[PDB]
Amino acid sequence: MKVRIATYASHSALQILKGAKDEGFETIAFGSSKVKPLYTKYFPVADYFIEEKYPEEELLNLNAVVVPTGSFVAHLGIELVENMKVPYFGNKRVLRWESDRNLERKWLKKAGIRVPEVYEDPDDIEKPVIVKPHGKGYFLAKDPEDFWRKAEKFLGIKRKEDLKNIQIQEYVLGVPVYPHYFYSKVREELELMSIDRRYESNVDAIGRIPAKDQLEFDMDITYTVIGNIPIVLRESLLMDVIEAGERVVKAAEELMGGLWGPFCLEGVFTPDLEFVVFEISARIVAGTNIFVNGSPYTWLRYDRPVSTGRRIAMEIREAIENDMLEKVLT
Amino acid sequence: MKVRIATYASHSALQILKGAKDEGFETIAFGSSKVKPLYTKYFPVADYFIEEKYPEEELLNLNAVVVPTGSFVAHLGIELVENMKVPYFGNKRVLRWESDRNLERKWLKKAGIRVPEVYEDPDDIEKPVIVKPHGKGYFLAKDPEDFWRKAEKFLGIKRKEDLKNIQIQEYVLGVPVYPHYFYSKVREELELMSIDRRYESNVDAIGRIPAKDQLEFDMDITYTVIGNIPIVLRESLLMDVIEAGERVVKAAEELMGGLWGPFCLEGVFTPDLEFVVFEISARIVAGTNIFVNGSPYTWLRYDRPVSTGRRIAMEIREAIENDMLEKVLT
Amino acid sequence: MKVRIATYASHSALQILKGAKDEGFETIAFGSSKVKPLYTKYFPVADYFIEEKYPEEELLNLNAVVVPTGSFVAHLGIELVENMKVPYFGNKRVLRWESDRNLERKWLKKAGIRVPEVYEDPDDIEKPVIVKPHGKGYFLAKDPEDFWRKAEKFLGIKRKEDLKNIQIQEYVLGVPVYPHYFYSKVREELELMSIDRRYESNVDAIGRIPAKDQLEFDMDITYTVIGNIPIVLRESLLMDVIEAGERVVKAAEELMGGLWGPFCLEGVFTPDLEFVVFEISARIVAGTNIFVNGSPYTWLRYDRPVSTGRRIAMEIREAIENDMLEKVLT
Numbered sequence: 001m002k003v004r005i006a007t008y009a010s011h012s013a014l015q016i017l018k019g020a021k022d023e024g025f026e027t028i029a030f031g032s033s034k035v036k037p038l039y040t041k042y043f044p045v046a047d048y049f050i051e052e053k054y055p056e057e058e059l060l061n062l063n064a065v066v067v068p069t070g071s072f073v074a075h076l077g078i079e080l081v082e083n084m085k086v087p088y089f090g091n092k093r094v095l096r097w098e099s100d101r102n103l104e105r106k107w108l109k110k111a112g113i114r115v116p117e118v119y120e121d122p123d124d125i126e127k128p129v130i131v132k133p134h135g136k137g138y139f140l141a142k143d144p145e146d147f148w149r150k151a152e153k154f155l156g157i158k159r160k161e162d163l164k165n166i167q168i169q170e171y172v173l174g175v176p177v178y179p180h181y182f183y184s185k186v187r188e189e190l191e192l193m194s195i196d197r198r199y200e201s202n203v204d205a206i207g208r209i210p211a212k213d214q215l216e217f218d219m220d221i222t223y224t225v226i227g228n229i230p231i232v233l234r235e236s237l238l239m240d241v242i243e244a245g246e247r248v249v250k251a252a253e254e255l256m257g258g259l260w261g262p263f264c265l266e267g268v269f270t271p272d273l274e275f276v277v278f279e280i281s282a283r284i285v286a287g288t289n290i291f292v293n294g295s296p297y298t299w300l301r302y303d304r305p306v307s308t309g310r311r312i313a314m315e316i317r318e319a320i321e322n323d324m325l326e327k328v329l330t
Numbered sequence: 331m332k333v334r335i336a337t338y339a340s341h342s343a344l345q346i347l348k349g350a351k352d353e354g355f356e357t358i359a360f361g362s363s364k365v366k367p368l369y370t371k372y373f374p375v376a377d378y379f380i381e382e383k384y385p386e387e388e389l390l391n392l393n394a395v396v397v398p399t400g401s402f403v404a405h406l407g408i409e410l411v412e413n414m415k416v417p418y419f420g421n422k423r424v425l426r427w428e429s430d431r432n433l434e435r436k437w438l439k440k441a442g443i444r445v446p447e448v449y450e451d452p453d454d455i456e457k458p459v460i461v462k463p464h465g466k467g468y469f470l471a472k473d474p475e476d477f478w479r480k481a482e483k484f485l486g487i488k489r490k491e492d493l494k495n496i497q498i499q500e501y502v503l504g505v506p507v508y509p510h511y512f513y514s515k516v517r518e519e520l521e522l523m524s525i526d527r528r529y530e531s532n533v534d535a536i537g538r539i540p541a542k543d544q545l546e547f548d549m550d551i552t553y554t555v556i557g558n559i560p561i562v563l564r565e566s567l568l569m570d571v572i573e574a575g576e577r578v579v580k581a582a583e584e585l586m587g588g589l590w591g592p593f594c595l596e597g598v599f600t601p602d603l604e605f606v607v608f609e610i611s612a613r614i615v616a617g618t619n620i621f622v623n624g625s626p627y628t629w630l631r632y633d634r635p636v637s638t639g640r641r642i643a644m645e646i647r648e649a650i651e652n653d654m655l656e657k658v659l660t
Numbered sequence: 661m662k663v664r665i666a667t668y669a670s671h672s673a674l675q676i677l678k679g680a681k682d683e684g685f686e687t688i689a690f691g692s693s694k695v696k697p698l699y700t701k702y703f704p705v706a707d708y709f710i711e712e713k714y715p716e717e718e719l720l721n722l723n724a725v726v727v728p729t730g731s732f733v734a735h736l737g738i739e740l741v742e743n744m745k746v747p748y749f750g751n752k753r754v755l756r757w758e759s760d761r762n763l764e765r766k767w768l769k770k771a772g773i774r775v776p777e778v779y780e781d782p783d784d785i786e787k788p789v790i791v792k793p794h795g796k797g798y799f800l801a802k803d804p805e806d807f808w809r810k811a812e813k814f815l816g817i818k819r820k821e822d823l824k825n826i827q828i829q830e831y832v833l834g835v836p837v838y839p840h841y842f843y844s845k846v847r848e849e850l851e852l853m854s855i856d857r858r859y860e861s862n863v864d865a866i867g868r869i870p871a872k873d874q875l876e877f878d879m880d881i882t883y884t885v886i887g888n889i890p891i892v893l894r895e896s897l898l899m900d901v902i903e904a905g906e907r908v909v910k911a912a913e914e915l916m917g918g919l920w921g922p923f924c925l926e927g928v929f930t931p932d933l934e935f936v937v938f939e940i941s942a943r944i945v946a947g948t949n950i951f952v953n954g955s956p957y958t959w960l961r962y963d964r965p966v967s968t969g970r971r972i973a974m975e976i977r978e979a980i981e982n983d984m985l986e987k988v989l990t
């Protein structure tokens with residue numbers, strides 16, 4: 001293949017580049033020199049490793065297409081990514097829509113996705129809410145009276161006009177669930193690729209601490225992502241999970257020039273079998289790293305292992321094969 | 331094959347029908363129209379989809395054998411299932427024995443399976459018990475005095491003669507474990523297929539909530555099944571897990587005309603390495619859905635991926651091949 | 661092959677012997693008669709089963725090489741293992757270094773591995789510590805004053821000179837993570853094989869118990885190993901995990917005549933992305949049992965399923981092929 005597949009050396013590059021190799025592409029990783037051995041020795045998936053944050057000129061010379069990882073913007077910055085001259089797999093317009101709280105909320109609302117209700121006025125609280133001062137210092141409130149007592153105790157607020165820099169959301173209790181999707185622009189087909197539960201510290205460690213021991217300390221709960229655990233869902237939940245993905249894609253077609261490639265809806269499942277979404281990640285997510293050898297979902301419909309990384313490379317190949325590569329790049 | 335494999339469109343139908351396809355059968359899903367796309371588009375495992383709860387006449391015409399899912403009776407009702415004219419993979423007599431609390435207890439006792447002791451009289455409590463008023467309102471009691479104090483506080487009981495509508499069981503603390511078995515009637519051989527931990531809401535979410543935050547609320551703990559997480563057991567535990575399965579099968583041979591096909595013992599492992607069983611599910615369980623591409627157990631003994639769904643289809647094929655199909659159907 | 665692969669019938673023998681078979685070796689399990697069916701009927705991976713703790717003469721006659729399981733010394737005792745005449749895969753000198761608290765600490769320090777700080781004097785406590793009286797009776801202390809109050813309340817200590825039989829360690833809160841490594845002496849190459857989270861009772865069950873219910877009882881937290889759950893790590897964490905493994909191997913080359921074959925660093929990941937190690941297991945660990953059909957890591961670099969058991973057999977084969985078997989045996 002003339003086209004080479006390139007990605008930033010973090011997040012999901014091992015999976016992406018292995019998938020590319022499996023589909024007959026030459027591969028490029030670019031990033032920190034510290035991690036070069038990971039991609040060239042321990043897991044030799046990168047044919048070229050460039051020790052630079054964003055080697056635009058070298059990437060153009062190598063006829064690269066960049067597959068954006070789930071931390072691509074974090075490492076490069078939104079402006080650099082939006083203005084990059086190297087072709088980008090996916091729609092670069094999505095980056096603002098997935099990251100700006102207001103745009104994200106608008107997208108999810110248009111897509112008819114269940115999300116926590118936001119309260120602009122504490123005096124409107126009628127069911128338990130989570131209060132987010134600007135995980136740092138998050139607390140629950142039952143009602144307006146409870147809220148104001150806690151605003152005084154935790155935030156020093158003694159007058160209503162003094163309240164500032166807070167978010168108040170409907171509190172939704174459920175188990176974390178992260179469905180991984182792929183929308184093929186070539187085939188105009190949505191797929192469910194896999195599902196995981198993100199493994200987080202210290203939040204996933206506190207359950208091992210008895211209540212008595214916890215209560216002696218002021219707990220500082222954190223949600224740092226450490227890894228991922230494979231799951232499957234109850235089968236009867238799949239249709240609504242898939243329909244949610246379809247609606248997100250459709251809404252993006254209207255709002256931002258489309259959504260294609262991998263994405264994920266991040267949320268929880270309540271005891272009443274409701275999927276409530278906290279965030280959309282409109283790129284490959286780290287949970288897909290479990291499924292290098294396929295998943296319980298891909299093995300229902302393919303005769304070979306298909307990771308999200310491989311699926312991306314399959315899409316790029318099929319685009320080239322059908323003379324429509326420009327359609328999947330921005 | 332003349333025989334087609336049919337199942338209700340929920341619970342584990344994707345796995346069942348993929349397994350059937352893998353073994354060279356034509357496949358039928360039947361159920362809600364809402365879920366037709368799941369089985370024909372997103373995961374195209376159903377050659378026929380019938381939009382009816384139980385299309386008996388159409389199934390007979392299609393020469394179907396029905397593989398009962400783990401929620402088959404829930405959707406159809408016990409009477410309809412017991413009287414169905416379409417051949418059923420497994421022993422239909424098992425349905426009452428697995429579902430009636432007294433029959434289930436008798437089965438497990440005959441099979442020498444460790445289960446929580448039941449207390450008929452609260453005044454007999456000598457170790458911690460779980461009290462189940464008729465997960466709704468479950469609480470622990472240490473001894474008779476503690477029980478009666480709590481019966482007054484939680485249930486309004488002020489006289490011993492006024493106590494009604496409760497179950498009292500030995501409280502057994504351990505980690506949830508769900509071994510998945512398959513008994514081949516064709517080969518007269520029990521297999522361990524896989525093992526999972528069922529993922530439940532809100533119970534599996536509360537560990538993420540610090541004790542201090544929990545204590546401000548009356549917790550309403552629920553056990554709604556959301557998904558499944560793959561596990562393996564400590565190897566030295568396998569023999570007793572397998573022996574338990576053998577005993578369950580043997581006991582069924584005496585009591586109810588036999589047990590064959592998939593089943594699962596649902597319970598916990600204590601810190602003293604004891605498997606304590608809460609329930610028997612005498613049909614395919616949703617935890618097997620993880621293992622479409624085989625499991626850490628099947629890959630010890632097969633040269634190809636074998637899910638429980640595939641194993642069912644293998645049994646039906648081998649029955650046909652050996653002119654003994656009638657032996658595995660009721 | 662003239663050489664046969666033998667292992668004790670527990671811990672990881674199914675995986676080890678399946679891996680051996682996959683690489684063209686004849687296989688031997690030895691151990692308790694009770695478990696013979698596991699290795700010969702339910703999972704037929706053992707060509708020979710010897711119903712003895714350590715059948716030295718029979719093993720020599722069968723030209724066996726013993727692959728030590730992760731519980732080998734537990735069942736046989738250190739002296740028997742150190743003096744065994746049957747060739748042993750790995751370095752027998754490592755057994756003391758991984759098991760003696762002081763030697764283990766020296767090894768990890770030489771290897772520059774982050775470990776909990778040990779306090780010899782309670783009056784030196786300046787950050788939260790875990791106190792380990794000789795999981796039985798473990799508690800946290802904030803500072804010297806808190807420690808002495810608790811030493812009085814829990815341990816009956818009323819004078820400083822009366823304190824004895826305790827360990828005091830820096831308390832490190834993070835999520836359990838168990839990377840599985842393999843060092844090839846034949847290739848002089850370290851590999852990351854897989855990663856798991858060990859499933860433990862009753863510790864992993866207490867998160868399901870609401871704080872209110874816990875507080876009515878004196879909790880007795882236990883860490884009995886029941887099983888294993890597959891995970892992957894955040895990709896950016898891999899380099900430092902791998903570097904830790906390299907340093908452990910290098911340090912062993914100096915201290916104890918080398919480390920080769922499988923091993924595992926057991927620890928936690930903090931919210932600041934720090935891997936803190938509690939223990940080294942310098943042999944195959946049970947978490948590798950999940951990966952009979954390979955792992956998310958091995959499928960990045962092999963075209964076939966490679967468990968740690970298979971990798972061991974691959975090493976023995978390659979040693980034989982290159983006339984250097986003596987180099988990997990002690």
Ligand SMILES: Nc1ncnc2c1ncn2[C@@H]1O[C@H](COP(=O)(O)O)[C@@H](O)[C@H]1O
Nearest residue numbers: 010011071074075076894895896897933
């Ligand atoms: N622009 C940046 N500058 C410095 N560090 C970063 C940047 N973006 C992400 N990181 C850090 O890089 C580490 C690995 O990132 P990730 O690719 O998300 O696993 C994390 O500790 C991040 O906080």
Ligand SMILES: Nc1ncnc2c1ncn2[C@@H]1O[C@H](COP(=O)(O)O)[C@@H](O)[C@H]1O
Nearest residue numbers: 116130132135169170171172173223278
């Ligand atoms: N509305 C909500 N209800 C319940 N839990 C939440 C809510 N919002 C956030 N969380 C939890 O708090 C964590 C951090 O929230 P955030 O800082 O908003 O990403 C999330 O990953 C969730 O686990």
Ligand SMILES: Nc1ncnc2c1ncn2[C@@H]1O[C@H](COP(=O)(O)O)[C@@H](O)[C@H]1O
Nearest residue numbers: 234235236237273340341401404405406
């Ligand atoms: N006979 C029935 N009538 C109506 N709903 C049902 C019936 N049986 C099960 N359900 C519901 O169908 C949903 C999916 O069931 P399952 O097949 O168990 O995943 C659950 O919300 C059940 O409560």
Ligand SMILES: Nc1ncnc2c1ncn2[C@@H]1O[C@H](COP(=O)(O)O)[C@@H](O)[C@H]1O
Nearest residue numbers: 446460462465499500501502503553608
């Ligand atoms: N005897 C028992 N000891 C400990 N936990 C139990 C016991 N019985 C039930 N449970 C827990 O409570 C949940 C709901 O119980 P049930 O409503 O009886 O199915 C179960 O799934 C278990 O997790």
Ligand SMILES: Nc1ncnc2c1ncn2[C@@H]1O[C@H](COP(=O)(O)O)[C@@H](O)[C@H]1O
Nearest residue numbers: 564565566567603670671731734735736
């Ligand atoms: N030397 C020994 N004598 C008796 N029992 C043992 C010995 N070593 C281990 N065990 C027990 O054997 C069981 C299984 O061990 P494992 O191989 O670690 O799964 C555990 O209950 C151990 O406590």
Ligand SMILES: Nc1ncnc2c1ncn2[C@@H]1O[C@H](COP(=O)(O)O)[C@@H](O)[C@H]1O
Nearest residue numbers: 776790792795829830831832833883938
């Ligand atoms: N320094 C420490 N900080 C936090 N947790 C620990 C520490 N040491 C031990 N633990 C926990 O307590 C369990 C039993 O400890 P041990 O008896 O030292 O193996 C370990 O498996 C850890 O989960």
Ligand SMILES: [Cl-]
Nearest residue numbers: 070285286287
């Ligand atoms: Cl991610």
Ligand SMILES: [Cl-]
Nearest residue numbers: 400615616617
């Ligand atoms: Cl089930």
Ligand SMILES: [Cl-]
Nearest residue numbers: 730945946947
């Ligand atoms: Cl182990």
Ligand code: NA
Nearest residue numbers: 098279280281
């Ligand atoms: Na987002």
Ligand code: NA
Nearest residue numbers: 428609610611
């Ligand atoms: Na049952």
Ligand code: NA
Nearest residue numbers: 758939940941
């Ligand atoms: Na050790």
